[PDB]
Structures are given as C-alpha cells and as structure tokens.
UniProtKB/Swiss-Prot annotation:
Gene3D superfamilies: MFS general substrate transporter like domains
Description of pH dependence: Optimum pH is 7.5.
Positions bearing the site annotation: Essential for pyridoxine transport: 74-75, 79, 81-82, 156, 161
Protein name stated in the entry: Thiamine transporter 2
Transmembrane segments: 1-16, 42-62, 70-90, 99-119, 133-153, 158-178, 198-218, 232-252, 258-278, 291-311, 321-341, 350-370
Extracellular topological domain residue ranges: 17-41, 91-98, 154-157, 219-231, 279-290, 342-349
Organism this protein belongs to: Homo sapiens
GO cellular component, one term: plasma membrane
Role, per record: Mediates high affinity thiamine uptake, probably via a proton anti-port mechanism. Has no folate transport activity. Mediates H(+)-dependent pyridoxine transport.
Pfam family, one: Folate_carrier
InterPro entries, alphabetized: Folate_carrier, MFS_trans_sf, ThTr-2
Amino acid sequence: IYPTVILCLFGFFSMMRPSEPFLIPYLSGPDKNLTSAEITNEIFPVWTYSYLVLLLPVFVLTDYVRYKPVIILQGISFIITWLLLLFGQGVKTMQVVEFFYGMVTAAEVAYYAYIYSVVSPEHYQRVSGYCRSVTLAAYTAGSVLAQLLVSLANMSYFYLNVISLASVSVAFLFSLFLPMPKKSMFFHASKRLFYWSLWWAFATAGFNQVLNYVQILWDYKAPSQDSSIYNGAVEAIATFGGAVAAFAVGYVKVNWDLLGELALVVFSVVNAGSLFLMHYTANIWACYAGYLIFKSSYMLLITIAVFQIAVNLNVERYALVFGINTFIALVIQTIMTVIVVDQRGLNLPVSIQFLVYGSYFAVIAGIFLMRSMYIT
Ligand SMILES: Cc1ncc(C[n+]2csc(CCO)c2C)c(N)n1
C-alpha cells in the first residue's frame, strides 16, 4: 500500500492544477498579449501533433525502461511545461510548451500501468479505479481552488500559475523515491470488440478535440477582459458530473448487452445536441450548461464502453488494447485538426468550429443508426 499511497499522493499533487481552467484567459490576458486567432491556429494544434508523436514511443518504451522513470519524466515535463508557461513568451515558446504538454499527457499511460507491478495480478481494476478517483478529485479540487481564489481573493493568473507550478513541483518531489518495479509486463511483446473500439476511438477523438477549444469559445462568447468569468467552477462541476456519471454506470446492475445500442445512441444524440447548444447560443450560461451536459453524457458513454470492452479481454493485454485504440483515436484527431482548425488546412475559427464538431457527433450517431438498420 506504500507504493499505492505514493502513487496516489503524486497523482493528487500532479492533477491538482489551478492553471488548467484559466489557461487561455491567462494566455490571452494582459500578461502575455496573445490574440485568440494565433492561439487557436498555431499554439493548440501542435499539442495534439506532439501528443500523437510521443504517444507511441512512450508507450512502447515504458516497459523497456520500466514504469518509474517515465513517471519521473512526466514530473520533469510538468516542471518544464509550467516553467515555460510562467516565464516564456512569444509563439514559438507556446509551441514548445505544447510539445512538452503532449508528453505530459502521454506519460499518463505509464503512470497508470506502474500500479500493475505493486499490488496483485488481479486487483488491477480496483486500485486503478482508486487512482482515477484520486486524479479526478484532485482536478475538481484544483478547479474549485482556482475559481474561489479568482472570485474572492481576486488573485492574478500569474500567481495562480505559480501555485500550479508549486503543486507539480511537490508532485515530482514525491515521485523520485517511488519503488522501482521488478515486475515488467513484457519485454519484447469479436462482433463487439472492433465495433466498440471504433466507437470509443471516434468518441474520444471528438472529446479530446472539444476539450481543447471549449475554453476558447468560453472567452469568445463573453470576453475574459471584462464582465467576469466563471471557468473554474464550471470545470469543477463538469468533472464532478463526469465522475458521478461513471460511478453511476458502474454502480447500477443491469444487462447492458440486451440493448445498449439504443441507450448509447440516445447519449450520442444528447452529446450532439449539447455541442449545437454550444455553437448556436448567444449567452454564456447556456454554453456552460451545455459543457456540463456534454461531458456528463460523454463520460456515461465511455464508462459503458470500457465496461463492455474490459470484461472481454484479460487484464494483461487490457492496457495493450487501450494502447492500440488511443493511437487510432489520435490519428483521427490529427486529421480532424489539420483540416478543421490548422492554419495550413481550412483555417476555421472557433466560431464556425462547434458546428463541425456537432456535425461530427451527429455523423457518428447516424452511422450507428445505420448499423442498427442492417436487416431493414
Ligand atoms: C499547457 C496546456 N494546458 C492545457 C491544454 C489544453 N487542454 C487539455 S485539457 C484542458 C482542460 C479543459 O478546459 C485544456 C485547456 C494545452 N493544449 N496545453
């Protein structure tokens, strides 16, 4: 339990980042003078570009070099990423910081697969669920902290970014004397399987692309320079809703395989409707409610998808299934980025971008409904 508690506390201090909600308001604020167009069209696409570039090498070398070094590399990457965010300036600096954040988010697979070697060959699911709950609770606490500080304390985003850097610093410091694994997973390595994997890849590509730009539409619909902004509380409530949706899907005892296609198409439709509510609204409270609804209804879909895909295959290659699924998901997301939002592609601003995102989520549901009418 001692490696478990070190991993738990490292995840808590690494995922409690108050600078995550107020990123673009901080990026586009008086501290750095970054216009929205240059952020959207150059800074953020390189994040998913580098994340795809570094997803396969990190996942393939995290067993060769064992799990702890990649976690300490994630800590170093957090340190350098937030050092560039706090002090670096320009646009090339903000592409380098996204390149580092790609590896930051790519080392999460190694962070999650480390716990395979510390407690039991079969209790992987329970401890991984505990670590997931700890990370989501850390994110919720960080968002509540950020919103509460900005609202009551009236505290500048530079000092809030300093707080996030200090948090990831303590997280890295609580990750050197991590018990180095002696157990390595490997050295040199149905009708529902491929179908549900394609569904998961599509849904998570759409989610990773929308999560990158909800903040940009948030300060587009209502400017962050004036009239206040409520990013942190909305993000905290949204991730709390996602967590309770996951826990509710796991908690309820029902035969999903009898008819899950209907109960999941009616959730993909709700996701598409929430995206269209994002795009077509004039207010910002409606957009915040749409974000709440969308992320709750998407975490429902993902918890269902991991429920059916987990029970089919063994725990040992359960991580390999996700490793070969998220690579396809990021390929889909990089084509989606290079045509939709990249400057060298079609150069769509955020204004006419959620229409395309809702069209994506509607086309996925239309393909699902077409698959149901195969007999007809
Ligand atoms: C350093 C850095 N932070 C965040 C993102 C994008 N991003 C991923 S998740 C998330 C929270 C949802 O608002 C955000 C903003 C980035 N590209 N680089």
